[PDB]
Design an enzyme around this catalytic site. Structure first.
Site, short mmCIF file in Angstrom:
data_model
loop_
_atom_site.label_atom_id
_atom_site.label_comp_id
_atom_site.label_asym_id
_atom_site.label_seq_id
_atom_site.Cartn_x
_atom_site.Cartn_y
_atom_site.Cartn_z
N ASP A 25 0.78 -1.24 0.00
CA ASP A 25 0.00 0.00 0.00
C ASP A 25 0.82 1.30 0.00
O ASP A 25 1.29 1.75 1.05
CB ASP A 25 -0.90 -0.03 1.24
N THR A 26 0.96 1.93 -1.17
CA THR A 26 1.71 3.18 -1.28
C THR A 26 1.02 4.36 -0.57
O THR A 26 1.64 5.40 -0.37
CB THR A 26 1.92 3.58 -2.77
N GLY A 27 -0.25 4.19 -0.21
CA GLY A 27 -0.97 5.26 0.48
C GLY A 27 -0.90 5.15 2.00
O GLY A 27 -1.56 5.89 2.71
C1 A1A Z 1 -1.65 9.06 7.37
O1 A1A Z 1 -2.43 7.89 7.54
C2 A1A Z 1 -2.26 6.77 6.78
O2 A1A Z 1 -1.41 6.69 5.87
N1 A1A Z 1 -3.07 5.73 7.06
C3 A1A Z 1 -3.06 4.44 6.39
C4 A1A Z 1 -4.32 4.31 5.47
O3 A1A Z 1 -5.46 4.33 5.95
N2 A1A Z 1 -4.06 4.15 4.14
N3 A1A Z 1 -4.83 4.43 2.99
C5 A1A Z 1 -4.86 5.86 2.54
C6 A1A Z 1 -5.29 6.96 3.52
C7 A1A Z 1 -6.58 6.96 4.16
C8 A1A Z 1 -6.93 8.02 5.06
C9 A1A Z 1 -6.00 9.08 5.33
C10 A1A Z 1 -4.72 9.08 4.69
C11 A1A Z 1 -4.37 8.03 3.79
C12 A1A Z 1 -6.16 3.82 2.85
C13 A1A Z 1 -6.46 2.28 2.61
O4 A1A Z 1 -5.82 1.91 1.40
C14 A1A Z 1 -6.02 1.27 3.73
C15 A1A Z 1 -6.85 -0.04 3.78
C16 A1A Z 1 -7.90 -0.21 4.75
C17 A1A Z 1 -8.68 -1.40 4.78
C18 A1A Z 1 -8.44 -2.44 3.82
C19 A1A Z 1 -7.40 -2.29 2.85
C20 A1A Z 1 -6.61 -1.09 2.82
C21 A1A Z 1 -8.03 2.23 2.44
O5 A1A Z 1 -8.77 2.92 3.17
N4 A1A Z 1 -8.57 1.45 1.50
C22 A1A Z 1 -10.02 1.36 1.25
C23 A1A Z 1 -10.56 2.38 0.27
C24 A1A Z 1 -10.13 3.72 0.02
C25 A1A Z 1 -10.82 4.47 -0.98
C26 A1A Z 1 -11.91 3.89 -1.72
C27 A1A Z 1 -12.33 2.54 -1.45
C28 A1A Z 1 -11.63 1.80 -0.45
C29 A1A Z 1 -11.88 0.37 0.01
C30 A1A Z 1 -10.52 -0.01 0.67
O6 A1A Z 1 -9.71 -0.49 -0.40
C31 A1A Z 1 -2.86 3.36 7.50
C32 A1A Z 1 -1.57 3.57 8.33
C33 A1A Z 1 -2.80 1.92 6.94
#
Ligand code: A1A
Lengths: 99, 99
Positions: A25-27
């Site tokens: 996960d790059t995000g």
């Molecule tokens: C600074 O904080 C951070 O880096 N937090 C990180 C984080 O939340 N990362 N991502 C990006 C993010 C989100 C909120 C704020 C900042 C950045 C999100 C994420 O990929 C993780 C995730 C969660 C559950 C299952 C799989 C993957 C996610 O939410 N995915 C879901 C999503 C997003 C958009 C549309 C649909 C769907 C469905 C599912 O795939 C944590 C430290 C892991």
């Protein structure tokens, strides 16, 4: 290798002698894994996602093998939906985004 | 271009004549943007992440430009902390993970 994104980028990782599946996960700034037992003391940390925040346990200098590549860094453990490999470890294996 | 992960992979996107900053997220199935107005009918949907679920509005057939490249796809709008470009659109611009 080169990974396309038509399906979720899930890879196998090895930690504590156990094999588990995890998402590249790059995000994600950090790496967070589902509830499990790790050695040493831990520190408290709060991480925020799309649905709000959650409290996790932070363990330092943990050895983790990702697709044959060994990395040693910080790992968080808590109520996460899936095991997530974040930027802190992605940079250690030399992963980049290309287009 | 090749993008390193020492910092968050933020890029400029153009949608609805508006320029916005967005995060390239390989861990996101869909694309979600902060509250804004878009043309067309929409459907209610619930998406989940770290922290729980949130309700968003789903718009289909939306055009977006990411670093010069054009892409078409479903876009969700809701109370997200940051704009996120997910796999549904990353695939259209030929984005891949390499290490
Ligand atoms: C600074 O904080 C951070 O880096 N937090 C990180 C984080 O939340 N990362 N991502 C990006 C993010 C989100 C909120 C704020 C900042 C950045 C999100 C994420 O990929 C993780 C995730 C969660 C559950 C299952 C799989 C993957 C996610 O939410 N995915 C879901 C999503 C997003 C958009 C549309 C649909 C769907 C469905 C599912 O795939 C944590 C430290 C892991």
């Amino acid at each position: 290798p080169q990974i396309t994104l038509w399906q979720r980028p899930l890879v196998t990782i090895k930690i504590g002698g156990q094999l588990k599946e995890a998402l590249l996960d790059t995000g994600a700034d950090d790496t967070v894994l589902e509830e499990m037992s790790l050695p040493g003391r831990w520190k408290p940390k709060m991480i925020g996602g799309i649905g709000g925040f959650i409290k996790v346990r932070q363990y330092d200098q943990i050895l983790i093998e990702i697709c044959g590549h060994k990395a040693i860094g910080t790992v968080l453990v808590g109520p996460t939906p899936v095991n997530i490999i974040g930027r802190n470890l992605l940079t250690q294996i030399g992963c980049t985004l290309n287009f």
